[PDB]
């Protein structure tokens, strides 16, 4: 009985993973626009904040390479409120 039911459960797991796979391009596109949205907003707010500071280049990369670096958590949620910060940094860990 456990043989038949675990084979059935592996088939069901493959079905769930293929639903995930079929949804992953849309989630990837939304995630890319999400992070570029947050970086562009942080760039404009840095451009309107960091004018008093001399010798400051707004949006200056800290990396010597020109390759795209995946944005860090404090790069994206660095200028937002503590509720969204706490959600995005410990929500999954603290979820139930």
């Amino acid at each position: 009985s456990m043989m038949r039911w675990n084979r059935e459960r592996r088939r069901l797991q493959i079905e769930d993973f293929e639903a995930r796979i079929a949804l992953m391009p849309l989630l990837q596109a939304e995630k890319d626009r999400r992070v570029l949205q947050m970086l562009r907003e942080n760039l404009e707010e840095e451009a309107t904040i960091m004018k008093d500071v001399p010798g400051w280049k707004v949006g200056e990369s800290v990396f010597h390479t020109t390759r795209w670096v995946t944005p860090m958590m404090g790069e994206l949620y660095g200028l937002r409120t503590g509720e969204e910060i706490l959600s995005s940094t410990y929500g999954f860990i603290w979820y139930t």
């Binding site: 084979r7 592996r10 797991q13 493959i14 796979i21 992953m24």
Partner: protein, 80 residues
């Protein structure tokens, strides 16, 4: 071979059952025909995204769509 075995089955049946189940657990996956399908199911389980290939021009064994007849299939798993 049966006097010592009946003697240990009369004195220590716990250890006889222990060594027998342990011996079966060791030797039986080398004799089962279903041990191949364990490997086959654990490699058929798509944890990652099936990253597509750039069509160079000559890849006949790669499908152009999930519903195309070429590629790996799981009919062996749907039947079993």
């Amino acid at each position: 071979v049966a006097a010592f075995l009946k003697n240990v089955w009369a004195k220590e049946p716990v250890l006889v059952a222990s060594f027998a189940i342990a011996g079966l657990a060791v030797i039986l996956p080398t004799l089962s025909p279903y041990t191949k399908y364990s490997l086959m199911i654990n490699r058929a389980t798509p944890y990652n995204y099936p990253v597509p290939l750039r069509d160079d021009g000559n890849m006949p064994d790669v499908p152009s769509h999930p519903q195309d007849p070429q590629g790996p299939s799981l009919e062996w798993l749907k039947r079993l």
